[PDB]
Amino acid sequence: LSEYAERHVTNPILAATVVALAEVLSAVVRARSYGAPEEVGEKAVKEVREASEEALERYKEGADESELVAEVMTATAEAVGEIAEATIEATDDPEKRRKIAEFAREKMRRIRELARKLVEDPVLAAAVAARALVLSAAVFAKAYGGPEEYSRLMRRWVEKAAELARRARRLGADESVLVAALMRVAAIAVTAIAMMTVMGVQNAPPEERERILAEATEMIARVLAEATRRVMKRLEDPEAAAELALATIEAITELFVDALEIIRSGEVASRLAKSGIEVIAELAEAAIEHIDDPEQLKKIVKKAAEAIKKIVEELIKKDVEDELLAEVTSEGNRKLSRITSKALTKIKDEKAAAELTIEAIEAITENFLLALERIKDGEVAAKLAEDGLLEIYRLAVSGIEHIDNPEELEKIVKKTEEAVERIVEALEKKDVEPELKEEVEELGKKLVEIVRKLAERK
Amino acid sequence: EELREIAERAEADMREISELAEELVEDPVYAVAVRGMALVGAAGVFALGVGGPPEVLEEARRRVEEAAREALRKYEEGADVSELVAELIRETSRQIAEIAEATIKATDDPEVLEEISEFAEERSRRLSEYAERHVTNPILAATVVALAEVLSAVVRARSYGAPEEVGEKAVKEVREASEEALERYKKGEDVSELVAELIRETSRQIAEIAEATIKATDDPEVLEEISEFAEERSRR
């Protein structure tokens, strides 16, 4: 029946709805195999039909039949996968599970093959193919009993990639870059899921198994990050460029937050944080390179600061070696310093300059407060403390040179001393060798002096 | 055993992804990069099933990604397509050969060795065909084919314990020959002479490697298999 429809129906939307109905009903028939709740099939059918009606209405409203086809096929694939997975849940028989999974793979193959002909838009077609392939791999993977959280996270990654792809298609970018992005991330995801399944079959320990997820999340994030700047470099609209920067930064931050929450090993988490900080910092710097109105630049700086703090805070929640934790949070802070300095160079009025300078000074100060709140040893805490005092100096003087006039300069003159005092006093409450503590407080008494002397030089 | 069943479908899925990108794409460099990353990313599953070193596999994947980044940066710079395509192919070649060389060490079983050899041979033949289809610069295509063939010969030689230096020397000579061919091309020499020199050096290299392997062997049927392989290589 679907063959006749696809061969002979003259309208793309009509054909898409026809094959969607056929596929959904045939998926229901397949689901009839083993007594899984009929309400699930009813819900899938109703969702497919309501979505089809909405798409038909939008087409009647003059909307693109290609977008409707992509949406309808996306929903169809989702429904088929959900039904097959629920069927997989209804039994404990291993052979039955792998048989059901093979049938589900066949269904995914059929839906993908059908999609490639109907979808006229290259980008949407690529996205639909990636979606279908990812869901196929995950639904199959469940058969052997691996934790579902990893599969859910991979689905989330694929979905985020698709969201970015549709956003950029709305932006009107060159299709080749987007197609490369979608297919590349899809390949990474598929191979990651397969490797995890292989480790599961081998009965590997979880301290080993987790490593693959960190390996995958890094490459997937960096792969999407690299695409962002390639696309952005060919845009021409400031609002659109800022939108792309903020959106991708938020998405990548959310994905890394989830991954850091999931993983459960020390060294793996340390390396993952170290990589993610750099990824987000690089993306932020890339976006900063392009011009903007002062508020638009200010928003970009604020978002980056929020992200890097949010990731660092996540790691604080986890048990990890003290020295490695210090290096991680100290290294992360330095990245905020750089982007703060790079952004400050583009401003041309005191109001934004003073606001950004204070904001970064406070933010960089805050992170150290949290790190010192959990440091395990005096020597580690001291070294991190010295670096913090030095860091805020670099931020202070680097701003001072660009500061315009004393009426503005008074704020940094006050705030820098405030920050130094807060850091030194907080460090004073912790247990440490007195000789090191005296040196740390001495450096604080020292650095504020030059800041004041440079400030005195109007 | 069934881990092989898992790896089979994983690899088939990866190949399907490669083909879909190849048809959907509209820019040669991006298509080459997509396929290059996909193939290597897939092979790791088969290597892992056999019990290969996981850290080496991860490093190889990282290396492939780095090569892709370098090629993308060059293409964005407007560099020549031919050089970039050759670079990507060569990087994938060394990466995959490294994975095979690691896998070869996993066990003494002849059965696993045969499986590894078959996998490597299939991948190598497909890669050679693809490279011949894509590369336009004559010298680049010829050198790509020669490198692939030589690597395949070394991989086969490993299965019988032949001296590794017998392979390494031919690899060094082949690298020198490819550099010389590129130099002659830059020097304005006739292309035909460069191609002839490349093929002749490759012929002597593979002949010497196989002859050393035959000398190192002591099994009749193993000698027969070596003879068959040499005949196939010469035909190609």
Site from A114, A139, A195 to mutate, B interface, most B CB atoms within 10 angstroms: A195
Question: Residue A70's Cα: distance from chain center in Å?
Answer: 24
| Deposited experimental method | cryo-EM
- CB-CB contact of A31 with A87 (8 Å): yes
Query: φ and ψ at A203, to 5 degrees?
Result: 65, 40
Site from B2, B15, B17 to mutate, A interface, most A CB atoms within 10 angstroms: B17
CA distance A46 to A129: 24
Nearest CB to A183; choose among B17, B27, B48: B17
Do the chains contact at A188 and B72, CB–CB below 8 Å? no
A120 close contact with B: CB closer than 8 A: no
Which chain B residue's Cα is nearest to A234? B76
- HEC string of chain B? CCHHHHHHHHHHHHHHHHHHHHHHCCCHHHHHHHHHHHHHHHHHHHHHHCCCCHHHHHHHHHHHHHHHHHHHHHHHCCCCHHHHHHHHHHHHHHHHHHHHHHHHCCCCCHHHHHHHHHHHHHHHHHHHHHHHHHCCCHHHHHHHHHHHHHHHHHHHHHCCCCCHHHHHHHHHHHHHHHHHHHHHHHCCCCHHHHHHHHHHHHHHHHHHHHHHHHHHCCCHHHHHHHHHHHHHHHHC
B2 close contact with A: CB closer than 8 A: yes
CA distance A169 to A151: 27
Do the chains contact at B17 and A199, CB–CB below 8 Å? no
- CB-CB contact of A134 with A186 (8 Å): yes
Which chain A residue's Cα is nearest to B64? A219
Angle at which helices A322-344 and A350-372 cross, to 10°: 180
Site from A95, A191, A207 to mutate, B interface, most B CB atoms within 10 angstroms: A191
Do the chains contact at A194 and B45, CB–CB below 8 Å? yes
Please report, as a single letter, which amino acid is at residue B216.
A
- Quote the Cα angle for A406-A411-A416, to 5°: 115
A207 close contact with B: CB closer than 8 A: no
Do the chains contact at B34 and A187, CB–CB below 8 Å? yes
Do the chains contact at A195 and B45, CB–CB below 8 Å? yes
CA distance A15 to A4: 10
Nearest CB to A190; choose among B7, B17, B65: B17
Please report, as a single letter, which amino acid is at residue A266.
G
- Give how far A452 is from chain B: nearest CA, Å: 46
- HEC string of B37-82? HHHHHHHHHHHHHCCCCHHHHHHHHHHHHHHHHHHHHHHHCCCCHH
User: H or E stretch including A60?
Assistant: helix A38-60
CA distance B165 to B209: 10
Q: Is A447 helix (H, G, I), strand (E, B) or coil?
A: helix
Do the chains contact at B6 and A126, CB–CB below 8 Å? no
- Give how far A98 is from chain B: nearest CA, Å: 11
Q: Which two tokens stand for residue B219?
A: 């099994």
Select from A93, A193, A185 the least CA-distant residue to A140.
A193
- Give how far A82 is from chain B: nearest CA, Å: 20
Q: Which two tokens stand for residue A261?
A: 């929450």
Q: Residues in chain B, how many?
A: 236
Do the chains contact at A179 and B48, CB–CB below 8 Å? no
B69 close contact with A: CB closer than 8 A: yes
CA distance A207 to A214: 12
Which chain B residue's Cα is nearest to A126? B24
Q: Which two tokens stand for residue A45?
A: 């059918």
Which chain A residue's Cα is nearest to B66? A219
- CB-CB contact of A333 with A390 (8 Å): no
Nearest CB to B34; choose among A180, A202, A215: A180
Nearest CB to B24; choose among A125, A198, A201: A125
Find all residues with CB under 8 Å of A157, minimum gap 6, and list them.
A185, A189, A217, A220, A255
Q: Is A263 helix (H, G, I), strand (E, B) or coil?
A: coil
Select from A199, A211, A216, A202 the least CA-distant residue to A161.
A216
B65 close contact with A: CB closer than 8 A: yes
A176 close contact with B: CB closer than 8 A: yes
Select from A54, A101, A58 the least CA-distant residue to A80.
A101
- Give how far B6 is from chain A: nearest CA, Å: 7
CA distances from A34 to A25, A88, A89, A90, B5 (A): 16, 9, 10, 7, 25
Q: Which two tokens stand for residue A367?
A: 């992170």
- Give how far A176 is from chain B: nearest CA, Å: 6
Q: Which two tokens stand for residue A161?
A: 């990639």
Do the chains contact at B24 and A202, CB–CB below 8 Å? no
Query: φ and ψ at A268, to 5 degrees?
Result: -60, -45
A133 close contact with B: CB closer than 8 A: yes
Other beta carbons within 10 angstroms of residue A47's beta carbon come to 16
- CB-CB contact of A71 with A58 (8 Å): no
- Give how far B14 is from chain A: nearest CA, Å: 7
CA distance A263 to A271: 12
Select from A398, A313, A309 the least CA-distant residue to A347.
A398
- CB-CB contact of A58 with A48 (8 Å): no
CA dihedral A283, A284, A290, A292 (to 10 degrees): 150
Widest CA span of chain B, in angstroms? Answer: 56
* Start-end of H helices in A318-429: 322-344, 350-372, 378-402, 406-429
Q: Is A120 helix (H, G, I), strand (E, B) or coil?
A: coil
Select from A225, A319, A204, A222 the least CA-distant residue to A268.
A319
- Quote the Cα angle for A253-A254-A260, to 5°: 85
Select from A90, A89, A53 the least CA-distant residue to A72.
A53
Partners of B49 on chain A (C-beta within 8 Å) are: 198
Q: Which two tokens stand for residue A134?
A: 């990812």
Other beta carbons within 10 angstroms of residue B34's beta carbon come to 26
Select from B77, B76, B135, B19 the least CA-distant residue to A177.
B76
Nearest CB to B24; choose among A122, A140, A215: A122
* Resolution expressed in Å: 4.1
Q: Long-range contacts for A246-251 (Cβ within 8 Å, ≥24 apart)?
A: A246/A299, A246/A300, A246/A303, A247/A164, A247/A167, A248/A164, A248/A224, A248/A283, A249/A280, A249/A283, A249/A284, A249/A287, A249/A303, A249/A304, A249/A307, A250/A303, A250/A307, A251/A160, A251/A163, A251/A164, A251/A224
Do the chains contact at B48 and A186, CB–CB below 8 Å? no
* Start-end of H helices in A61-174: 65-89, 94-118, 122-141, 148-171
Interrupted after residues, chain B (C–N over 2.5 Å): none
A-to-B residue pairs, Cβ atoms closer than 8 angstroms: 95
Please report, as a single letter, which amino acid is at residue B69.
R
CA distance A59 to A69: 10
